Amino acid sequence: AIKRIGNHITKSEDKREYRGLELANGIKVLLISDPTTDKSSAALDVHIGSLSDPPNIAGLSHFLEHMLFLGTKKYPKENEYSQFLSEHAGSSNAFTSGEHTNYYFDVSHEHLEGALDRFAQFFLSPLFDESAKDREVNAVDSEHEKNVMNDAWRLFQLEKATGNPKHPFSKFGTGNKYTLETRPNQEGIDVRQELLKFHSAYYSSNLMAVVVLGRESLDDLTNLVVKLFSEVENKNVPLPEFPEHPFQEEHLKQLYKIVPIKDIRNLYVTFPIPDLQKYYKSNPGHYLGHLIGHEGPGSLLSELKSKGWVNTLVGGQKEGARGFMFFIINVDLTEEGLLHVEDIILHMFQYIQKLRAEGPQEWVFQELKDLNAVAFRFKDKERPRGYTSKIAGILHYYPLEEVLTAEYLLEEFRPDLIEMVLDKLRPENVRVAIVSKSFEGKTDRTEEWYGTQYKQEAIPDEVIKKWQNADLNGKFKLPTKNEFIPTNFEILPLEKEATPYPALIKDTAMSKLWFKQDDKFFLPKANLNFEFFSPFAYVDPLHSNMAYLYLELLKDSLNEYAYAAELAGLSYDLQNTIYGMYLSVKGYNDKQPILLKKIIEKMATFEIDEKRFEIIKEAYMRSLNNFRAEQPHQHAMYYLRLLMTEVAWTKDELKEALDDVTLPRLKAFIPQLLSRLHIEALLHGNITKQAALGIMQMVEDTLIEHAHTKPLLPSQLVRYREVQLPDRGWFVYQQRNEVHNNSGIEIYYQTDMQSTSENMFLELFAQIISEPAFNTLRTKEQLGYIVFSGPRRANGIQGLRFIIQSEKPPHYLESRVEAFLITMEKSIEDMTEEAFQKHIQALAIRRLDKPKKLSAESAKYWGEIISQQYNFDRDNTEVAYLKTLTKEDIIKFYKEMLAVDAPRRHKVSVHVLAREMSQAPALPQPEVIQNMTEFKRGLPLFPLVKPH
Amino acid sequence: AIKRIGNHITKSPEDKREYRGLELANGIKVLLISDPTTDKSSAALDVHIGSLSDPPNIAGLSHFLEHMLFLGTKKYPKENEYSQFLSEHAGSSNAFTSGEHTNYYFDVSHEHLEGALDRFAQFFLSPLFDESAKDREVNAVDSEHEKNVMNDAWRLFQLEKATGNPKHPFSKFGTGNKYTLETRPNQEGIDVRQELLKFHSAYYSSNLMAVVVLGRESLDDLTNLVVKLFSEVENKNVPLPEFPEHPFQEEHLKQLYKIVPIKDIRNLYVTFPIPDLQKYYKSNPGHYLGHLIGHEGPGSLLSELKSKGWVNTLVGGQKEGARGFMFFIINVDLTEEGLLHVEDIILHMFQYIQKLRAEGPQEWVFQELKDLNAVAFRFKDKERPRGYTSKIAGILHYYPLEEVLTAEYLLEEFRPDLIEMVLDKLRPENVRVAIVSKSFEGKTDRTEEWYGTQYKQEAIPDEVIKKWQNADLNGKFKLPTKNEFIPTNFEILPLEKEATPYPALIKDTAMSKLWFKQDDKFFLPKANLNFEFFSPFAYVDPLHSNMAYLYLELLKDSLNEYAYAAELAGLSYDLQNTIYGMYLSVKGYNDKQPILLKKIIEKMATFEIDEKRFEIIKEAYMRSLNNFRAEQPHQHAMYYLRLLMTEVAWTKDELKEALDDVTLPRLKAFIPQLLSRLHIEALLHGNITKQAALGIMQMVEDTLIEHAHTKPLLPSQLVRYREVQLPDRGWFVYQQRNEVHNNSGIEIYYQTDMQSTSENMFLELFAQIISEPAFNTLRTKEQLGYIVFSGPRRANGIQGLRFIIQSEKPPHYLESRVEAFLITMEKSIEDMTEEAFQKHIQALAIRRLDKPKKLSAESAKYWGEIISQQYNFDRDNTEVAYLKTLTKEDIIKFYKEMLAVDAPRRHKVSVHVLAREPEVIQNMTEFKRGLPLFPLVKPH
């Protein structure tokens, strides 16, 4: 079905040459041309979701997009695609939505044609084998199992199900093993014949959106892929749409009271509204979302803060199905924010009434049009994975010149649209849902799949009538015009000082200043990552708590000014570390010094409100013991970083230490912390040397002006060490989770500090153990959905870790982990030298890649300056060293460090029990670990790194 | 001349040594000491003779005779034969010369009574006085006067002796120099010897001898052993030279002195001459005055003098003189501005005297001091075998043989009329003033005769006199309150089922930890308590460390005035700091340590700061800090060694610079932060019970919680500091330049290992095998220096070997010859026989092995084990049981891998100290960056 149409595309700063076309069998085609990109890519998206499933089997398309991986007629072997993208550094993945399932992958250079050959003919011949089926049912059951107690998916499906039960919206989306194979076989239904029915009828027809990120040309990739795509055959499946919202007045004006697992409190407001997807030029939803969820002077959130009932909120237009859509408002609750909800809804309707009074505005439309004009014009670059899938996601709705100016450019103002959407948002149409823990013994109607409990009580007409008649204005105002808007678009010419790496241009006992100028990207932006260092941060539980609440109330105060800048494209973040305080400004080159001056001057002389401190205190006290509820792989990684640092306060002691946090204690603490400190900063981007010197001087002078900061002495620039293992030990201990009925494990291996050799030894071993572990443990042995192999580097020491979540006894799992190590040990000799080359080159191109976004190279340089390495050219160093490796070297790595007959064995695992609870070699008895401090008592400590 | 008069002597029952006093017919006072348990014997001779007896033209003749009288008897006319007999048998002799005594004493190894007595009796028969004794003892006198040139005691005493009546024998010189002995006599041709035989025959032989024998034989053998060889002393009936008049005969009253010193010292000297109260030993008013003047308590004189900030300390009381007269002295400290307010000071002493003249004498005070000194005599502890004999031979002359033990430690009666008499004696007509100050340059013409210091008469004028007498009133001065408490309980407590020989852990909580041991061996009414307060904030940064320092220092300065009167009752304490926390010691009796410890905790909980006190402590520590440029460079080397090989260490430079910011509000904020949350640890040892020990600790920590709401620490923050691991090959060094001393120190450190049970005894035996031959070869033969030391190092649970040598040398020459000494000892290893081996390991054994002798010893050793968190209570016995199972090759193999020059395990590191004129170490922080850290020790 070879038909071709293309022309000039309005593509903004970008250099990627473009064309688009569409094949006569209903296939959208995008041609991307770029001669400077390493990794080429492509990504197919089928415009069919899981709301188009058959009425008997739930999560059938979910299981199909899993099952479309394995097996074609041209290459019927199982992992062939995946192994071919493990050979040439590719990484495919897929996800599922209500109406879309979207395949995507990556490749290096010319290897795209080989990758596409496996990828394209999945559609002709899918196989659906014994083992594929019988293992994917376990992978789907684990996919549902991690989402059982996750409160986001819980409330998602509970909203999905309490609508129209006649609408397909009510039907389940993922499906556990019970609906996938237990439900059909007790009905006699063959799984495979539905898969073939579904692939033939729905999938094969239309509505594909392919893209091709290629580095060849335009014309040659064109006449490659047009020839290569004529085998997809049109079937004329009509566009599946829904002509009505799921709330046909049986389910309107209704409340719900939901009991969560984690102690959270949230309030959910929903409006069903007709579709404005045809109105993507004017897009009233951006105007409504801009005005409602704004955070400025006279905003609604400012009022909710001023009464202290709501911490933060977000609202706006929520996307839904093709036919209908939603409009949400989601706020946080405090104690009497939980008790005085009705007044919160009254204030939302008063702000809506303020919008009902003034109506639409035009200077807002001009302001947002200029902001999206600039912001779309100066876009940096794109990820070769994810960009192509995103554009192919939005290619469905737009003509061939609007594929790029998709929604990031808006032409016209249609205020009649704003009166209509204003007329929908009324108290007749509101749905309310309260999430609170205290609703125990009171909720009878149980969820069918997950098991949460809720109750609907029709709102008493008195509250409804009071909502409609009482719509007036109190103290809510329209948001003042922004001033955080740039006029700085002038590219600064690089100086005679043409260094390619940031140099230490200023050294004191107070600070350290590193500086470059952007030779490549030529954008008017710069980065600033000041990092504060202080002794008193981690001295005790008490002072660490004081640090977290200090920086928390700091951001809570300086948020209300900061919101307009962050909305304008000037972002910041104050955070705390074990070392000190962390500052990161990023954005345009307009008001860099102005915002930075204000932030630093504000956090210099800072004050505390009483009930504000009480709310932040209570809330973080509740957030501490919430750390019981996470997945046990995270819980295990938390215990690993507990044992492998020098000092570490656990969450129990940190929780208990808030028993003494009084407000005068904080107000005494603050200037003692701020008294003396050290600053080390990375400055990167479109500025000059002298302006960088002025910004740094500015900073330290502001500090000396406020709190009279004096420099530190260089003997308390300490870092934390990491615990030595006794050269032969295999250590382990266990915890027990309360909520989840699953066990986790993490299997640590201490090699050595980062010397130039050890990095490339461990990287090559890591890549040769990456893909076969996914092939045999999760896929072939079906150990668990969460499998994570690879290298962990902490405190300047290299390590190897394996993360396995399943529902098993963990010692069986240890035994089969070691069995996988023996299997790899034998497979090492089997690997050919040519296969080794198809691995060391993938390590070179995996390691070597030039940054695309400026934030990437700045984050990399920063990530190396905070580690005191400063070796900015380790990439060239490591790659040049990397070519001088052999295979017998990796046995010399395997034997003494990793094997079981190892004299230098440095092994340690962590068990995490569940709520309730082919061969293995001779593993010795383990030790029990009662006191983690008494563990670390007699053990040596590692050195730190020699600075380059 | 065998005459005997004695009987049973009353001794407080704890003592068991049996005594007998008698006196021989030739005028010899005899006491008999029988202790069959003493290792070393000694002997003593007391002559009641004075420099006043020596002829008016030549001073100190008897001093030069009693020097020259040592060598040569008729039974042993050889020169050194006495001295050689005491050099063989470990003996050591030493005598002094006073205004009314010359008192010979000596000792001997075990049994040499007969021997030494053959070398001791014919001093009375035959003194020789030959050419050589004369010509050597004149050099001995010249060296005694030359070293007593700069001795300030003798200088001020002679200046008090000589500025009275210049005819009175009080103005004589006690020792006598070379001028009177051989400069004026030989130019006048006068024979010293004939005057020496005159003096010896007429004066010494007559009477009033005080022979005494520290023996271990029996009560009689030594008795008729010395009475046999003491009959050649023949009575002469020389009358007792006494003075019936004071030497300050109104010519020198109401007088000042202005003294020019060599050393930068400052002192103020008030002197009162007073009559004889020696017959009145019943009340002893002179020590009563020393009690009431030098008291430091509520309403005391020095209490207000401190409150005015002029005077650190004082001392006063009765000063003995000749038989006839006695003295009464007051010795006070001076500040800078104390030199301007002299008359004010003297007015305050008079004011005090007047307060005592107003409310008068006291009787219950005398009874209290009587009961406390009754207890202090009842429960004596011990006595040194040397020095004791010369003392008790000193008072044998003045007291009957029954009063020789209840000597002054008992007071019969109260004499308020006498106290009125001496209260009438402390008046400004009587005062004698002397002032010490360096600032008296060009102003004092009147030079001292012997030493050559310069002074001034400078009588106090009369307006200053008259203001003292008629204008006399009281301010803030009050007599002291009674502190009887309870002294009635001295009963011993019987041992219970808990018969441990080592302290048992009777309580463990997360707040404290309590170890306990009732006294089995001593059965003495004494108790010891030790306390550690652990807290993280001590050594976090130089500012916090300074705040902790100043806190405990000024805490002591606050509590001293209240506590000192309790310290007079027999309960001593000490507060100091650690790098970890604070150190509290409470030592004394069992009766009232609970009330004292209660008030100590109640006091240091609620604590305040004074301004000028804070300023004085601040300035004082600023001096103590910037002094550290000026100490001995071997100490400099030990300080830098403890800097480099610990985890964190703040040098004195940062502590010096950071003190600019220590203000009062900052400390007053810091104190409750420190005291908020902490850990306790305690050793309890003495005659006590388990329940009262548990109850006192409970009560104590409850009071601690009562004040500042004490909460326990978290058991993950009881960390300790580790020690730096050398890289298995390193020989590291760097240098430090002294500023003041033109001398170069050096310390040669060697890392072996952690304390395993073998390594302690490896290092002790190897240390001892290089101990005595290093003493033989280094200073004598190699002539390295005078301050040379070697041996172990115990720090952070890690052993070590070191060589501290300070000299004025190039430091690398000294390292090279130190390595030559290691090679010399290395080959000196392989030539060792069995005999040297066995005496050496037995030497180590008896060096280590000893039973204890007092509760402070065992309590200090057990505390020394709990502070290191080792807890190995019987390492003594285990290490000794291990020690005999070693060979020569065990220490050869111990030596080679760690210590040799071609060693794989050679852990060597040095510190160079230069005079004012491997790898290098640029930054000590960048040094400690990349070296690993050792583990700690598992507690048993």
And the tokens for B791? 């041996």
Minimal C-alpha gap between B862 and chain A (Å): 23
Cα separation, A927 vs A908, whole angstroms: 10
Give the CA dihedral A34, A37, A40, A43, nearest 10 degrees: -70
Residue from A432, A166, A164, A169 nearest A320 by CA: A169
Minimal C-alpha gap between A891 and chain B (Å): 28
For B927, name the nearest residue in chain A, comparing CA atoms only.
A946
**HSE (side-chain half, CA atoms, 13 Å) at B267:** 17
Q: Between A663-675 and A610-624, two packed helices, what is the crossing angle to 10 degrees? A: 90
Q: Is B552 on the interface with A (CB under 8 A)?
A: no
Count the Cβ atoms, other than its own, within 10 Å of residue B206. 19
And the tokens for A29? 């085609």
Asked whether the beta carbons of B761 and B879 are under 8 A apart, the reply is yes
Q: How far is CA B12 from CA A835, B16, B281, B405, in A?
A: 100, 9, 20, 9
Residue from B515, B932, B812 nearest B685 by CA: B515
Q: Which residues of B are annotated as a binding site for ATP?
A: 384, 850-856
Cα separation, A1 vs A234, whole angstroms: 8
Chain B residues closer than 8 Å to A539 by CB? 536, 540
Count the Cβ atoms, other than its own, within 10 Å of residue A681. 22
Chain B residues closer than 8 Å to A942 by CB? 932
Given an 8 Å threshold on Cβ–Cβ distance, is A944 in contact with B932?
no
DSSP string over A837-864: HHHHHHHHHHH----SSHHHHHHHHHHH
Contacts of B612 (CB under 8 A, 6+ apart): B309
Cα separation, B318 vs B322, whole angstroms: 13
- A13, A17, A65, A130: the active-site residue: A65
At residue B744, φ and ψ (nearest 5 deg) are -115, 110
At residue B517, φ and ψ (nearest 5 deg) are -160, 105
| H/E stretch holding B573 | strand B572-577
Q: DSSP letter at A578? A: S
Count the Cβ atoms, other than its own, within 10 Å of residue A292. 22
Asked whether the beta carbons of B15 and B37 are under 8 A apart, the reply is no
Given an 8 Å threshold on Cβ–Cβ distance, is B925 in contact with A715?
yes
Residue from A793, A781, A788, A758 nearest A867 by CA: A793
| H/E stretch holding B578 | none
Cα separation, A150 vs A556, whole angstroms: 28
Can you give the length of chain B in residues? 940
Given an 8 Å threshold on Cβ–Cβ distance, is A717 in contact with B541?
no
Asked whether the beta carbons of B27 and B209 are under 8 A apart, the reply is yes
Chain A residues closer than 8 Å to B654 by CB? 713, 715
Find the CB nearest B725 among A540, A717, A940. Answer: A940
The experimental technique behind this entry is cryo-EM
Best A713, A933, A939, A942 member to test B by mutation, with max B CBs in 10 Å, is: A713
Q: How far is CA A359 from CA A291, A297, A350, A474, A886, in A?
A: 11, 19, 14, 17, 73
For A654, name the nearest residue in chain B, comparing CA atoms only.
B714
Q: DSSP letter at A710? A: B
Asked whether the beta carbons of B882 and B758 are under 8 A apart, the reply is yes
Residue from A917, A594, A945 nearest A754 by CA: A945
- Residue A829: Cβ-neighbour burial (10 angstroms; 0-12, 13-18, 19+): exposed
And the tokens for A256? 């719900």
Residue from B797, B725, B706, B724 nearest B760 by CA: B797
Find the CB nearest A939 among B650, B715, B935. Answer: B935
Minimal C-alpha gap between A717 and chain B (Å): 9
Chain A residues closer than 8 Å to B935 by CB? 937-940
Q: How far is CA A872 from CA A679, A686, A946, B133, in A?
A: 20, 20, 14, 87
Asked whether the beta carbons of B466 and B393 are under 8 A apart, the reply is no
Q: DSSP letter at A396? A: G
Resolution for this experimental structure (Å) = 4.1
Contacts of B624 (CB under 8 A, 6+ apart): none
Given an 8 Å threshold on Cβ–Cβ distance, is B536 in contact with A540?
yes
Contacts of B170 (CB under 8 A, 6+ apart): B52, B161, B164, B243, B247, B321, B322
At residue A2, φ and ψ (nearest 5 deg) are -80, 95
Cα separation, A669 vs A551, whole angstroms: 12
Q: Is B66 a catalytic residue?
A: yes
Cα separation, B610 vs B629, whole angstroms: 30
For A933, name the nearest residue in chain B, comparing CA atoms only.
B716
User: E strands within A401-519?
Assistant: 431-435, 445-446, 453-454, 503-507, 512-515
